[PDB]
A paper describes a structure:
Env is a class I fusion trimeric protein that engages CD4 and its CCR5 or CXCR4 coreceptor to mediate target cell fusion. The Env complexes on the viral surface consist of three heterodimeric gp120-gp41 protomers. Here, we describe the triple tandem trimer (TTT) design, in which three Env protomers are genetically linked in a single open reading frame and express as native-like trimers.
Therefore, we conceived a triple tandem trimer (TTT) design, encompassing three successive gp140 protomers genetically linked in a single open reading frame. Moreover, the R6 furin cleavage site28 was replaced by a 15-residue flexible linker to assure furin independence, akin to previous uncleaved single-chain (SC) Env constructs. However, size-exclusion chromatography (SEC) and PAGE analyses showed that the BG505 TTT preparation consisted of covalently linked trimers exclusively, while SOSIP.v8 and SC controls also contained substantial amounts of dimers and monomers. Negative-stain electron microscopy (nsEM) revealed that >85% of StrepTactinXT-purified TTT trimers displayed a native-like morphology, while StrepTactinXT-purified SC and SOSIP.v8 preparations contained substantial amounts of dimers and monomers. We did not observe density for the SC and TTT linkers, probably due to their high flexibility. Furthermore, although the relatively low resolution precluded the assignment of side chains and their interactions, PGT124 and 35O22 bound BG505 TTT with similar angles of approach to those observed with other Env trimers.
Residue numbers in the entry:
A (entry chain c): 7 to 67, 67A, 67B, 67C, 68 to 95, 95A, 95B, 95C, ...
B (entry chain f): 1 to 82, 82A, 82B, 82C, 83 to 100, 100A, 100B, 100C, ...
C (entry chain e): 129 to 141, 150 to 185, 188 to 309, 312 to 321, 321A, 322 to 398, 412 to 458, 465 to 473
D (entry chain G): 188 to 226
């Protein structure tokens, strides 16, 4: 499974590799973003492919006894991804499974107030005798928010479907919440308020039938 | 100098033959090694098998009883087939080119060396899901603006109602508009279907510019172009 | 013994060469026992038939280990005669080994002589002053071994790179056995090097003098040993404390007509029986660390077969 | 518990004396061979 690591922004990090070798090694260091194309940083302990910046480096085993640590100088927000450490040594055979995933985290990022937008059910969806209030949150950090629905003043607590926050291209987070209701209940209550609590701040968006 | 592009069905029934194809545009397929890797949710990524330039295959022992990899000569493509798939084979499949290096620590004559492999160039990746439920086409409903901030910047979007399975590709004006666009992760409703929404932030002075959202669901072969208007 | 391979994890070739063996053994108290494990070379154990094994010496002899303080490294020995007796040294540089010597001297003691027990290759011996000298009782008899003495020594580099460890285990009251504990680092093969060009040159100067008793035109060749016991068909010697047996097919593999370095794989023994009487066996206690010894090959023990072929040996 | 063991077991082998020899010391006169003397 995955093991966590926490590094400050701009400081150098040393990622430790598990299941260290018993003999001569030609290790591989792979960077994998969730769902994207994985990109290796190191194929031979020292060597890197063309295009990889000099910030990433791997420890050669110049004398037997050294461990494989992935050293990153000037850690930025884009370096936050999983890191796999493929291990090949003389004493062991064909290594099929990659090394344990290393969840790198870059602390001290600038927090962002959540950009919230509330959409009432569309006319064509109401034509289908269904309603889904859609509350979207974009461009916020850290990705830890709580969503609450309000009918006028009473909470809803029913028919709510919320996704875990997922990163976008802005290196901030994005999330969505769907409140499924019948058209009669949508027109029943005066207005509906989506409340997003981010850390100690709280943002409320209200929408009402025309 | 090599570009890889994965192509797969996205949905396969249980106990069948999953087939995916990786298209290569960079160079010849008989010069470098090639391999398949799969990323399953909740688990670390697994190395399943590889094919050499001399056309020799090797497979991971856990799935070697079920997997096979082939390489096309006329087409710059490499295919992967998996027999008798179950609910555990659902994953994002990546094709990758690989280079064979041998690491030597002693005398060449004695042996005392081993081959190590590394995958420098990868493909974008194709998602493959396994389920017995049939395919569903997405319903698209235009979420109109509220006429949202004080004035200038305002938000609109398109709601992709319940569908099956992932993913859904959403574009705007057939790719003409790119500023402020943001597509959000889908949600798995209790019905067993995914629903998403894609929004755009545009100035209120521009509001009509005839914004058309194009939704493509490959598993259902549905291309839906929907207009939005207040 | 209950024995397993040490899992090379590579192609299953030399897994038996070195083997992990667990067994029950006595302790300092008569009523209690202790179950322990060790590492045994392939050459010291034989199967039963499952993964059961047993020591080679059990069916044939009683076994005793050497005390770990005495060293098997040979040191010079000067042999001397008492009062009223003398040693006659012949100083002729072309002495055939038999017959009248014209220049004779007398001594009370010989020079420093190292008791090097070797086979097919004489190690750390004396050097011929000129040419290379060939000696045999009846050179025309193939049943008499041929002793070749060199004038230019050929250097040999022997090594076991396995970083072995010793494990002290109490067998009885006042008894501490020394097992092979573990192997630190890589598991490689013990082997010996000799420079190829020097060996070729010395083989040439050997055959030029061999032609003095068989003819200039007759073609002779060199091949490996023809068979017999282990100690005869191999280059057998004691390096660093442990007993090495090196395959010599890569040395005598040339046919010579009228007119970089090579390496030899070596295996390791520690259960050795005496070459005169079988019924007494010695266990060589394992030596810690990496073993490496450099020696001078200075002589050969060849055997004729009856063109001609020569095969080494001499047990 | 009340279990015990001999002191010599962990360190040495043990042998008992034969019960006929006496450890009582008796006089010893040390002497030199021919050609030597004691001062
Ligand atoms: C008795 O007789 C015996 C037989 O005659 C004799 O046996 C000899 O034993 C010794 C040891 O006991 C053996 O020595 C070993 O040699 C190994 C091989 O070294 C050769 O190969 C490497 C690698 O070659 C690749 O890379 C270069 C570029 O660097 C390319 O040009 C090559 O083409 C090749 O790359 C391609 O090909 C590969 C294979 O197809 C592909 O995989 C690859 O992708 C490419 O396509 C060369 O670099 C070596 O060159 C060096 O030596 C020459 C002379 O030959 C010198 O000019 C100069 O010094 C060169 O630097 C050589 O040609 C070694 O790997 C091995 O040493 C490693 O292992 C030990 C033990 O684990 C480590 O402690 C040690 O640190 C070494 O690790 C280094 O190297 C590896 C390999 O990359 C690294 O991964 C590792 O991190 C570390 O790198 C560090 O050091 C590098 C420099 O050394 C540096 O560049 C790095 O950046 C990093 O800092 C060991 O020395 C010897 O081979 C035996 N003899 C024979 C004939 O086999 C015995 O001695 C005799 N005597 C006795 C028993 O007493
Ligand atoms: C032929 O003679 C040579 C020397 O005359 C022998 O080489 C000697 O081998 C021994 C055992 O391998 C070496 O002893 C070791 O010395 C190192 C020194 O650092 C020490 O650390 C070890 O604990 C061990 O005592 C010895 O040094 C070495 N002599 C030289 C000059 O290097 C060789 O073994 C002889 N050949 C045969 C077959 O006996
Ligand atoms: C191996 O042979 C060489 C050459 O005969 C020996 O080197 C000689 O050693 C003697 C005695 O120590 C010296 O008097 C000579 O001057 C040395 N000559 C040279 C050229 O080095 C060497 O000692 C021999 N080694 C062994 C272990 O027998
Ligand atoms: C063989 O293994 C031993 C350990 O079993 C190694 O001994 C170490 O040597 C280094 C040398 O600086 C010391 O710092 C360590 O304290 C030693 N370890 C112990 C446990 O004593 C030895 O170096 C190895 N030899 C080879 C050739 O690999
Ligand atoms: C056996 O080992 C010795 C020493 O390890 C080798 O002799 C060395 O040769 C180099 C030549 O490059 C010299 O620079 C050193 O001074 C030599 N060492 C000594 C102690 O003289 C020798 O070449 C090896 N022989 C073989 C056949 O490999
Ligand atoms: C070691 O492996 C070899 C490989 O064929 C096998 O023949 C042998 O029985 C094995 N021995 C043990 C003790 O596992
Ligand atoms: C030691 O004796 C026990 C007796 O129960 C036996 O089970 C065990 O196999 C013996 N040890 C070995 C290595 O066979
Ligand atoms: C002891 O066993 C070995 C194993 O093959 C055999 O070669 C040898 O002849 C046996 N010795 C006796 C005396 O039975
Ligand atoms: C050795 O040389 C001497 C010198 O004449 C000779 O008499 C003798 O026959 C030779 N013996 C052999 C076996 O060559
Ligand atoms: C040497 O051997 C041959 C046959 O092998 C024999 O005829 C001859 O008599 C032997 N030489 C001596 C001196 O006995
Ligand atoms: C062999 O060659 C030598 C030259 O060193 C020569 O003196 C001798 O006469 C030759 N022998 C014969 C039989 O021709
Ligand atoms: C020695 O090596 C040769 C080839 O290198 C091989 O044919 C022969 O069988 C080997 N001898 C032994 C005893 O292993
Ligand atoms: C022995 O010589 C033959 C002929 O040159 C060669 O083919 C073979 O490889 C040699 N073997 C060894 C062990 O040197
Ligand atoms: C044996 O036991 C005694 C009891 O204290 C202890 O002093 C002594 O060191 C032990 N001997 C050994 C070799 O451990």
């Amino acid at each position: 499974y995955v093991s966590p690591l926490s590094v400050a922004l701009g400081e150098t990090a040393r990622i430790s590799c598990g299941r260290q070798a018993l003999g001569s090694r030609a290790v591989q260091w792979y960077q994998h973003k969730p769902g994207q194309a994985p990109i290796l940083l190191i194929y031979n302990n020292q060597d890197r492919p063309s295009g990889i910046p000099e910030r990433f480096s791997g420890t050669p085993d110049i004398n037997f006894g050294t461990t494989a640590t992935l050293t990153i100088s000037g850690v930025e927000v884009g370096d936050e991804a999983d890191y796999y450490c493929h291990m090949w040594d003389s004493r062991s055979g064909f290594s099929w499974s990659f090394g344990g995933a290393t969840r790198l985290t870059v602390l001290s990022q600038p927090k962002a107030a959540p950009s919230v937008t509330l959409f009432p059910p569309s006319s064509e969806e109401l034509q289908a005798n269904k309603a889904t209030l859609v509350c979207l949150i974009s461009d916020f950090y850290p990705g830890a928010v709580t969503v609450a629905w309000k009918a006028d003043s009473s909470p809803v607590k029913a028919g709510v479907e919320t996704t875990t926050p997922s990163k976008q291209s802005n290196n901030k987070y994005a999330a969505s919440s769907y409140l499924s209701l019948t058209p009669e209940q949508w027109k029943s209550h005066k207005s509906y308020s989506c409340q997003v609590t981010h850390e100690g701040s709280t943002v409320e968006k209200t929408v009402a039938p025309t | 100098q090599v570009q890889l592009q994965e192509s797969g069905p996205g949905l396969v029934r249980p106990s069948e033959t999953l087939s995916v194809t990786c298209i290569v545009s960079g160079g010849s397929i008989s010069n470098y090694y090639w391999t398949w890797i799969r990323q399953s949710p909740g688990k670390g990524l697994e190395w399943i098998g590889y094919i050499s330039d001399r056309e020799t295959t090797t497979y991971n022992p856990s799935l070697n009883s079920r997997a096979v990899i082939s390489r096309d000569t006329s087409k710059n493509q490499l295919s992967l087939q998996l027999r008798s798939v179950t609910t555990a084979d659902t994953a994002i499949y990546f094709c990758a080119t690989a280079r064979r290096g041998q690491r030597i620590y002693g005398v060449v004559s004695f042996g005392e060396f081993f081959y190590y492999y590394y995958m420098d160039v990868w493909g974008k990746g194709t998602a493959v899901t396994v389920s017995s439920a049939s395919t569903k086409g997405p319903s698209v409903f235009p979420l109109a603006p509220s006429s949202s901030t004080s004035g200038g910047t305002a938000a609109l979007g398109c709601l992709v109602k319940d569908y099956f399975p992932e993913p859904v590709t959403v574009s705007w004006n057939s790719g003409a508009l790119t500023s402020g666009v943001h597509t959000f992760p889908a949600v798995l409703q209790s019905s067993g279907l995914y629903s998403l929404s894609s929004v755009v932030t545009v100035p209120s002075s521009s509001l009509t510019q005839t914004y058309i959202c194009n939704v493509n669901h490959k598993p259902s072969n549905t291309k839906v172009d929907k207009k939005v208007e207040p | 013994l209950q024995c397993t391979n040490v899992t090379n994890n590579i192609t299953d070739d030399m897994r038996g060469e070195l083997k992990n063996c667990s067994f029950n053994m006595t302790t300092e108290l008569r009523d209690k026992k202790q179950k322990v494990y060790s590492l045994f070379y392939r050459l010291d154990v034989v199967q039963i038939n499952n993964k059961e094994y047993r020591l080679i010496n059990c069916n044939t002899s009683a076994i005793t280990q050497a005390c770990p303080k005495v060293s098997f490294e040979p040191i010079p020995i000067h042999y001397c005669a008492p009062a009223g007796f003398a040693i006659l040294k012949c100083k002729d540089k072309k002495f055939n080994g038999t017959g009248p010597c014209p220049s004779v001297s007398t001594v009370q003691c010989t020079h420093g002589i190292k008791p090097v027990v070797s086979t097919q290759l004489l190690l750390n011996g004396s050097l011929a002053e000129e040419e290379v000298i060939i000696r045999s009782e009846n050179i025309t008899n193939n049943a008499k071994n041929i002793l070749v003495q060199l004038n230019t020594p050929v250097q040999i580099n022997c090594t076991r790179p396995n970083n072995n460890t010793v494990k002290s285990i109490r067998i009885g009251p006042g008894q501490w056995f020394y097992y092979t504990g573990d192997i630190i680092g890589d598991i490689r093969q013990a082997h010996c090097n000799v420079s190829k060009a020097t060996w070729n040159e010395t083989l040439g100067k050997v055959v030029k003098q061999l032609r003095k008793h068989f003819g200039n035109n007759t073609i002779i060749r060199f091949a490996n040993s023809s068979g017999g016991d282990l100690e005869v068909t191999t280059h057998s010697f004691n390096c660093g404390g442990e007993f090495f047996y090196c395959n010599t097919s890569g040395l005598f593999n040339s046919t010579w007509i009228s007119n970089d370095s090579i390496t030899l794989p070596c295996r390791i023994k520690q259960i050795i029986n005496m070459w005169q009487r079988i019924g007494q066996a010695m266990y060589a206690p394992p030596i810690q660390g990496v073993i490496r010894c450099v020696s001078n090959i200075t002589g050969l023990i060849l055997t004729r077969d009856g063109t001609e072929t020569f095969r080494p040996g001499g047990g």
